[PDB]
């Protein structure tokens, strides 16, 4: 039997990323770059997309690992920009079925730094469609817009 | 229920407001019973009617 695999990860309107798509590897994928480049942010987006349970999600620093802190802020809100945001995964099923899972993220206006999540799923999408293009509208001269 | 319907007709005949007619009818029925004009039979067999 052929085991399923994760094909790619897509980020839209995150802190520092407007619309970026990482193509995963069959065995190992590595992220490199100086401090503050955005590696841990990519990890967080993936996990978020995986388990949208807002109760659970808590992104501590790598230092202070293992300390149950109850911090005032879970650390997700700041990784998002104003407006609408997305995080999606493309998966090839053992059945050789292409399925697109993801979440719609959006900041909540108000003093409390809260976040809203709406999961979604897509089945049967043609192999020629890329999520980056599916989630954006081409407005103006190569100045695309994101769509709700 | 039949007594309440009869009271509604009287109230219509007096051109009165349709508000609280069920209450007004109960008050009137209780007043007639209290004035010994009507005898009321409450049987367990009649499911409380």
């Amino acid at each position: 039997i052929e085991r399923g695999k994760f094909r790619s990860l897509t980020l839209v309107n995150w802190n520092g990323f407007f619309a970026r798509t990482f193509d995963l590897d069959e065995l190992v994928t590595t992220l490199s770059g100086g401090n503050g480049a955005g590696k841990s942010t990519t990890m967080a987006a993936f996990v978020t997309a995986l388990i949208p349970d807002l109760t659970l999600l808590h992104f501590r620093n790598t230092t202070e690992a293992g300390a149950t802190s109850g911090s005032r802020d879970k650390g997700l809100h700041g990784k998002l920009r104003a407006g609408v945001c997305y995080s999606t995964l493309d998966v090839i099923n053992s059945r050789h079925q292409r399925v697109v899972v993801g979440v719609r993220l959006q900041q909540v206006a108000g003093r409390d730094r809260k976040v809203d999540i709406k999961p979604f799923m897509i089945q049967g999408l043609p192999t020629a469609i890329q999520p980056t293009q599916l989630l954006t509208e081409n407005v103006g001269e190569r100045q695309a817009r994101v769509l709700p | 229920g039949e007594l309440i319907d009869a009271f509604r007709e009287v109230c219509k005949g007096f051109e009165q407001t349709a508000e609280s007619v069920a209450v007004r009818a109960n008050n009137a029925i209780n007043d007639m019973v209290r004035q010994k004009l009507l005898n009321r039979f409450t049987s367990e067999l009649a499911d409380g009617n």
Partner: protein, 212 residues
């Protein structure tokens, strides 16, 4: 030695407070719920650490009490840290009737399952129907609308007693329910064959009951 639980707290009390059952129970108890023999988990827990709980709650100026029938409950003092409230007279009428129903061997064959209609029928059989109707409405004179209103008030108060833990509805049918021994507190004014006035005085002195 220093940094040792015994310096600040008895081991058994800390062991109790660390149990997974405590928060539930605490929450409930504070809300006024009575605990009987049927909810094993809770009851057993209570039994195991009785004195520690009593000592604990004492800090609040509240007594954790154990009735002879085996049910636990909270009785606040005058200086209580936790508010205290009183039941309505309709709640008492339904309470004393539920008590007589529990005792009745004539209905023991039901295996504890009673219907709201049976409760209502027993209540009207004993109390003054037309005079009791005064609490529903000042003009009540036996009209069916007023009789249905009385039945609905009963249904409501019964639902409140359920929350106090005095009665449990069936899992799928809400028109039927089962009694528990906690109802015997409504008989606190007559369990001893003595002068009613003196009993009442004793009860108000103990903080069990208030007049109206």
């Amino acid at each position: 030695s220093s940094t040792h639980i015994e310096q600040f707290m008895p081991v058994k009390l800390a062991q109790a407070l660390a149990n997974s059952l405590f928060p539930e129970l605490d929450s409930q108890l504070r809300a006024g719920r009575h605990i009987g023999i049927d909810d094993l988990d809770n009851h057993a827990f209570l039994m195991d650490f009785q004195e520690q709980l009593e000592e604990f709650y004492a800090r609040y100026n509240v007594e954790l009490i154990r009735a002879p029938e085996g049910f636990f409950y909270l009785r606040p003092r005058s200086t209580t840290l936790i508010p205290r409230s009183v039941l309505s007279e309709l709640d008492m009428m339904v309470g004393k009737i539920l008590c007589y129903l529990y005792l009745s061997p004539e209905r023991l064959a039901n295996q504890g399952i009673f219907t709201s209609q049976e409760l209502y029928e027993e209540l009207i059989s004993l109390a003054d129907e037309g005079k009791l109707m005064k609490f529903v409405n000042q003009r009540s004179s036996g009209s069916d609308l007023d009789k249905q209103k009385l039945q609905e008030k009963v249904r409501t108060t019964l639902n409140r007693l359920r929350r106090l833990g005095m009665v449990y509805f069936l899992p799928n049918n809400n028109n039927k329910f089962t009694i528990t021994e906690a109802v015997f507190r409504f008989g606190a004014d007559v369990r001893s064959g003595d002068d009613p006035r003196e009993i009442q005085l004793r009860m108000i002195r103990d903080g069990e009951a208030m007049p109206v």
